[PDB]
Design a protein around this ligand. Structure first.
Ligand SMILES: CCCCCCCCCCCCCCCCCC(=O)OC[C@H](COP(=O)(O)OCCN)OC(=O)CCCCCCCCCCCCCCCCC
Ligand SMILES: CCCCCCCCCCCC(=O)OC[C@H](COP(=O)(O)OCC[N+](C)(C)C)OC(=O)CCCCCCCCCCC
Ligand code: SF4
Ligand code: SF4
Ligand code: SF4
Ligand code: SF4
Ligand code: SF4
Ligand code: FES
Ligand SMILES: [K+]
Ligand SMILES: [Zn+2]
Lengths: 86, 115, 160, 124, 160, 64, 139, 192, 139, 68
């Protein structure tokens, strides 16, 4: 429960120290996504107009079957999170 | 079949005293093979600096309390040791390991867009 | 069977006239084709609802814990009932609405019931059921399979 | 003038010279969409410093070609049927209402259909 | 033979079995399979039936283009197939085939959505290479070349 | 499930260092999430039961 | 339970017939499955083949309920109601959701008249500034 | 009554004669000592293998002289991409973004809006040819046959930038290869 | 197909001038019936020789003498050379011939390694326009 | 160096993978890029013929005479 599983996960420290996650029920499952970077979320590629990014969590969306599972998992990874109340 | 050189069988230690001894034994093995790491990987630093780097990594996990985290940390530390001694890591990876390392003020980050 | 076939019955380019006689004279196995495809025959024409809604009638995933498995040995099954009737019937089934250990159930029950449902064929152990009961094999001989003779260290198995 | 080269307009105001490499297309001078980057601004880059502009791909503008096709006219009907003039190799078939007194283009091809009884007004 | 699939039950072929379990035995077996496949190829060419090649269901398979451009329901299914895919009922499976390298299997987990929740690919060469140390011990360096080649190791399959 | 599909680092050859080095990930074109078109409805129903009758629980008989 | 003409914020209608068990108006199986298929074909009988060029493509209720509760096998002029709503009445499924909002809630040219784009389940009424620019799975 | 009484099975039964017979001894051979030594010392089977190889020396080789000759191609072949036009010169693509969603490699980028004349047309259509897997899903998903793959394969480039096809490049290919595209579509029409 | 009788037979048909060109690029002296010539100038031939093997019945003569580029072959004859069709693009039916609404220029080969190589670029405008500053006097 | 196929050119099918280099030209200089998944044998031969054409335009010794 209180184990610092982030110590043996292998993920970088910024998920714990800098990035903030959101727990929300969008309409039957609970999801976890990450708030965008203030800078570096997107920037237009000068060559072909592609959308560049340095956010490696931009496409990651965890799914959970209960509200309890989403909160328990986020705590187990030491994530900074806020719950978006439905 | 036979295991590779310097391979240890995985075991879940249930005694903090026994875990502490296993950590100290492994820490000695890192120090003893430090001169070997400089030889195989052709590092540009003395073995004395390598031993200092080893101690820092062991000092990071000095105050880990939970036993289950100790076993996973110990198991991963053994795998890394078997990787270094057997020369499985390529020399570029070990050179970059020693390449690792004052934060700017609010205004300084504000000017350049911050993080 | 796939016995030898004459070279002229294969869609390759062979020899003609005096050169075919020479080819038959100097070939160890003269009925072997050259492998070059025939130009005039090969590739001459160049290439240039609910009744049937079986997906939505998929089988439902049903699990069997020790609780329900105990109910089958005690109360029987819907195909081979051994249960009471009326309010007595519902009293016995509601016993298996909570945790009921099967090892405890196996302790106090007639072996005549265990050997009829748990085991099979009068106490015989249940054997791992086969994925295809038609899988049979038989050894054959070179006059049948046409492969290497017996002195080679392999054998050929047919359908049987 | 740099205005007919960097602005989107319904019709070109001058004659398109197909040897002018600053035009958006060999047959059209100005861009045909509001978000389309002008071809003059695109070629003013570091990557075009020592390149031959004449050999770069310059397809003809479809907006100029589609409107040179004559308006189709239907006799004794109020609905125009179009399927790309190719059948299985055209576009999905659609029905075009002709109640209004104007030429209504096809949703896929762009061919503008009209009623023959409305011919004179549309030609005006 | 063990778990037949896709008209392998409607053809005839034989399996070669070795007796000494070395590189020469497997070479003979792979040469027999050469001739057994050619035996199946001839049968399929002589037994190919008429009819649809894909399932008659536009919620899984694309409709014909001629029907897509005239039928509204075909155009909807074509639009939905290529923009959302098709949902697969929740569950899991372990399906194996007789791949030329050996037993290739996939462990797919479905979450009821149009994407697979998990897809574990069981590679026959992955298991063969995991027995190389047991097999190659004692042999010389040129023999390791033979043992590698007799396993039929394609490392895209092994690593994937 | 929490590991991002592109990872965190990428390699390149550094001319000054004369070797291949790891660097934090940057993508010229970020991965596009078309998965958001998940159906607002459920496609498959509740299914059809195929449990053997030999394994279904018996039902009590009606009153005499 | 499929529907086209049911929405609890508006009055009750029975001009879509997709809620048969009309359960929307009625207070409190293979026939029902067949009934849903039969009703679905009627809407698609006259519907134009516009899904590629239609803004409701990935978010169309007619598409999703044709897939879910229908079989896989099977000309009205436009109007102008302002520069905000693009009208293609060929695609209308005649569900009267626009009438209920425009007369009961809106009270109408209105400050809320653009909400009819949300209520129209098909591409009959779509946002004009948004036209042709994006697909719902891109967003 | 099955073999379950002895924990047996139908699959467990080996066929008749499964057990290998007794291995032979030195006296139980069919060839004399001199017969086996003559095949051994004089390399009987080795000389036969040489003769089989020498037969191939007198057969027609398979080699074709590329680029003066080309291997066979089919109307289904997947090659260089190209956007297509109607005979009137209007683009077939209605910027419907079907091919973008299907594309397994996400190699297609589309930006669309309303044309000045009012048509649903794209102003940005890029295919990253270094990311595409030449899989044909875009061609199969197009409802107006706008995006196709031509039988071309010979478009290797010095720089990786030249493999970033934009709309102007793709439309130029469609004009260049329209006749060859017509061959493939007409031949492969019945099967699509 | 590898005999000297075939080579001498083809050498006599082509003549020294044509065969020496084949002795420089083709590596093989070959003869055939002229089938057509594309807009770039390549000459396309078909071989009636019974000893020619399967995939060698069609071949091209390039315009150059020292270098031959496959991209110089016009798209009409690129398909025919690869045995895609048995109808050369100079024998097409009126219906089967493509109809173009734009002028058709001479065939241009691959332009890599030259100044004419294709330069990619973004065809879209910047997604936001900055405010053009205007100054007004302060009252 | 010849870069063949979408994987070596830019990553291809595995462009968004955690364990794939997005183009071999991040590690070594590349002289020609052959497209396809996979490029056909003729597509590779055409790429080789392009490299041989560029090799025949080399002017290394006249570079010493006229540029150095
Ligand atoms: C460059 C110079 C040229 C060099 C090459 C010279 C060419 C000549 C080759 C010299 C060898 C000639 C001798 C060959 C006869 C001996 C072999 C023989 O007779 O067989 C061995 C014999 C055993 O009898 P066996 O063959 O096993 O018969 C039963 C088979 N199931 O065992 C015996 O009992 C035979 C004993 C010998 C009796 C005959 C003398
Ligand atoms: C003249 C100088 C050049 C050749 C010298 C050596 C030749 C072989 C001698 C040993 C033969 C032997 O031992 O014969 C044993 C075998 C056959 O016997 P079997 O298996 O019992 O036959 C079974 C029963 N039959 C008899 C009914 C068939 O014959 C061979 O395989 C002969 C192969 C020769 C064909 C290739 C000729 C050209 C070779 C290349 C030359 C440069
Ligand atoms: S309203 Fe729906 S069914 Fe009708 S054309 Fe638009 S997307 Fe297709
Ligand atoms: S226009 Fe739209 S909202 Fe109005 S009746 Fe038709 S489908 Fe319903
Ligand atoms: S062929 Fe496949 S990978 Fe290539 S652009 Fe088309 S859909 Fe994408
Ligand atoms: S599928 Fe065809 S019409 Fe749709 S966006 Fe792609 S090329 Fe254009
Ligand atoms: S064929 Fe395609 S997937 Fe395979 S290595 Fe080449 S580019 Fe990569
Ligand atoms: S929802 Fe009840 S009839 Fe329309
Ligand atoms: K709508
Ligand atoms: Zn049309």
């Amino acid at each position: 429960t209180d184990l610092a599983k982030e110590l043996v996960s292998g993920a970088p420290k910024e998920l714990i120290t800098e990035r903030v996650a959101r727990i929300y029920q969008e309409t039957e499952t609970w999801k976890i996504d990450w708030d965008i970077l203030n800078k570096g979320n997107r920037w237009e590629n000068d060559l072909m107009g592609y959308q560049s990014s340095s956010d490696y969590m931009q496409g990651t969306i965890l799914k959970f079957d209960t509200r309890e599972g989403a909160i328990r998992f986020a705590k187990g990874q030491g994530w900074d999170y806020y719950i978006q109340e439905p | 079949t036979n295991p590779t050189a310097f391979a240890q069988t995985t075991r879940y230690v249930k005694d903090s005293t026994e875990m502490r001894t296993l950590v100290l034994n492994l820490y000695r093995r890192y120090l003893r093979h430090s001169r070997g790491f400089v030889n195989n990987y052709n590092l540009d630093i003395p073995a004395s600096q390598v031993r200092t780097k080893i101690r820092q990594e062991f000092e990071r996990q000095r105050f880990v309390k939970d036993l289950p985290l100790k076993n996973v940390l110990y198991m991963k530390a053994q795998m890394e040791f078997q990787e270094l001694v057997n020369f499985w890591k390529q020399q570029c990876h070990v050179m970059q390991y020693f390449e690792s390392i004052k934060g700017d003020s609010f205004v300084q980050k504000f000017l350049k867009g911050a993080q | 069977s796939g016995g030898p076939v004459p070279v002229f019955k294969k869609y390759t380019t062979g020899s003609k006239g005096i050169w075919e006689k020479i080819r038959q004279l100097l070939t160890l196995v003269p009925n072997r084709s050259t492998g070059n495809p025939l130009v005039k025959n090969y590739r001459v024409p160049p290439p240039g609802y609910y009744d049937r809604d079986h997906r939505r009638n998929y089988p439902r995933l049903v699990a069997f814990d020790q609780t329900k498995v105990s109910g089958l040995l005690t109360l029987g099954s819907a195909q081979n009932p051994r249960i009471s009737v009326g309010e007595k019937g519902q009293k016995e089934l509601a016993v298996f609405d909570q945790s009921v250990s099967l090892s405890s159930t196996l302790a106090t029950i007639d072996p005549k019931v265990v050997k009829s449902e748990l085991l099979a064929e009068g106490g015989s152990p249940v054997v791992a059921p086969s994925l295809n009961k038609k899988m049979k094999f038989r050894l054959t001989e070179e006059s049948e399979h046409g492969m290497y003779p017996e002195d080679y260290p392999i054998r050929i198995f047919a359908q049987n | 003038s740099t205005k007919e080269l960097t602005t989107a307009r319904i019709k070109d105001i001058s004659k398109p010279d197909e040897n002018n490499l600053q035009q958006q297309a060999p047959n059209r001078i100005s861009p045909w969409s509001k978000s389309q980057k002008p071809r003059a601004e695109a070629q003013d880059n570091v990557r075009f410093a020592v390149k031959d502009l004449a050999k770069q791909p310059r397809p003809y503008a479809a907006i100029d070609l589609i409107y040179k096709q004559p308006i189709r006219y239907i006799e004794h009907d109020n609905v125009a049927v179009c399927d790309g003039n190719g059948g299985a190799q055209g576009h999905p078939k659609v029905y075009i209402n002709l109640d209004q007194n104007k030429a209504i283009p096809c949703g896929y091809c762009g061919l503008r259909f009209a009623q023959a009884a409305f011919k004179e007004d549309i030609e005006s | 033979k063990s778990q037949p699939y896709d008209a392998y039950d409607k053809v005839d072929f034989d399996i070669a079995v070795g007796t000494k379990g070395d590189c020469y035995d497997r070479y003979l077996i792979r040469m027999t399979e050469f001739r057994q496949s050619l035996r199946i190829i001839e049968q399929c060419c002589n037994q190919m039936p008429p009819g649809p090649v894909k399932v008659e269901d536009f919620k899984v398979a694309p409709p014909p283009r001629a029907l897509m451009k005239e039928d509204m329901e075909a155009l909807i299914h074509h639009f939905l197939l290529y923009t959302k895919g098709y949902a697969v009922p929740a569950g899991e499976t372990y399906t194996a085939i007789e791949a030329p390298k050996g037993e290739m299997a996939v462990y797919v987990v479905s979450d009821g959505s149009e994407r697979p929740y998990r897809c574990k690919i069981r590679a026959p060469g992955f298991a063969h290479l995991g027995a190389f140390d047991h097999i190659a011990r004692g042999h010389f360096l040129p023999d390791a070349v033979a043992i590698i080649g007799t396993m039929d190791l394609v490392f895209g399959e092994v690593d994937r | 499930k929490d590991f991002p599909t592109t990872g965190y680092t990428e390699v390149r050859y550094d001319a000054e260092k004369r070797r291949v080095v790891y660097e934090p990930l940057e993508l010229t074109q970020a991965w596009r999430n078309f998965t958001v078109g998940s159906s607002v409805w459920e496609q498959v129903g509740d299914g059809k039961d195929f449990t053997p009758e030999s394994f279904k629980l018996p039902t009590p008989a009606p009153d005499p | 339970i499929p529907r086209y003409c049911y929405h609890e914020k508006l009055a009750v209608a029975g001009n879509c017939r997709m809620c048969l068990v009309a359960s929307c108006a009625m207070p409190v199986t293979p026939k029902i499955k067949k009934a849903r298929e039969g009703v679905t074909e009627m809407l698609l009988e006259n519907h134009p083949l516009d899904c590629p060029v239609c803004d409701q493509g990935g978010e169309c209720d007619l598409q999703e309920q044709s897939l879910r509760y229908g079989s896989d096998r099977g000309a009205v002029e436009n109007k102008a109601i302002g520069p905000l709503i693009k009208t293609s009445m060929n695609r209308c499924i005649h569900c009267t959701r626009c009438v209920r909002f425009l007369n009961d809630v809106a009270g109408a040219n209105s400050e809320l008249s653009a909400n009819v784009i949300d209520l129209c389940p098909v591409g009959a009424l779509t946002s004009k500034p948004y036209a042709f620019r994006a697909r719902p799975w891109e967003l | 009554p099955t073999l379950a009484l002895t924990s047996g099975s139908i699959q467990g039964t080996h066929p008749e004669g499964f057990r290998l017979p007794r291995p032979k001894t030195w006296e139980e051979s069919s060839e004399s000592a001199l017969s086996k030594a003559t095949k051994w010392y004089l390399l009987s089977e080795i000389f036969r293998g040489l003769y089989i190889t020498l037969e191939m020396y007198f057969r027609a080789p398979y080699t074709i002289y590329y680029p003066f000759e080309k291997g066979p191609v089919s109307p289904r072949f997947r090659g260089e991409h190209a956007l297509r036009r109607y005979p009137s010169g209007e683009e077939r693509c209605i910027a419907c973004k079907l091919c973008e969603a299907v594309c397994p490699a996400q190699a297609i980028t589309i930006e669309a809006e309303e044309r000045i004349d009012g048509s649903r047309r794209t102003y940005k259509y890029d295919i990253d040819m270094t990311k595409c897997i030449y899989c044909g899903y875009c061609q199969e998903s197009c409802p107006v046959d706008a995006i196709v793959e031509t039988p071309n394969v010979e478009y290797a480039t010095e720089t990786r930038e030249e493999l970033l096809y934009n709309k102007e490049k793709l439309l130029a290919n469609g004009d260049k290869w329209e006749q060859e595209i017509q061959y493939a579509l007409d031949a492969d029409a019945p099967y699509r | 197909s590898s005999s000297i009788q075939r080579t001498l037979r083809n050498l006599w048909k082509n003549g020294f001038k044509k065969s020496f060109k084949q002795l420089q690029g083709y590596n093989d002296i070959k003869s055939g019936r002229l089938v057509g010539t594309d807009s770039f100038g390549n000459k396309f031939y078909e071989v009636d020789d019974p000893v020619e093997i399967h995939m060698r019945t069609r071949f091209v003569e390039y315009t150059g003498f020292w270098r031959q580029d496959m991209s110089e072959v016009e798209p009409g004859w690129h398909y025919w050379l690869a045995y895609g069709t048995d109808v050369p693009p100079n024998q097409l039916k009126p219906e089967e011939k493509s109809v173009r609404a734009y002028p058709v220029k001479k065939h241009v080969p691959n332009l890599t390694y030259t100044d004419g190589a294709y330069v990619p670029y973004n065809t879209a405008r910047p997604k936001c326009a900055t405010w053009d500053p205007k100054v007004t006097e302060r009252p | 160096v010849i870069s063949m196929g979408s994987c070596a050119n830019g990553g291809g099918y595995y462009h968004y993978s955690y364990s794939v280099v997005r183009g071999v030209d991040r590690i070594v200089p590349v002289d020609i890029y052959v497209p396809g998944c996979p490029p056909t044998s003729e597509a590779l031969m055409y790429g080789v013929f392009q490299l041989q054409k560029k090799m025949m335009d080399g002017q290394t010794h006249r570079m010493w005479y006229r540029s150095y």
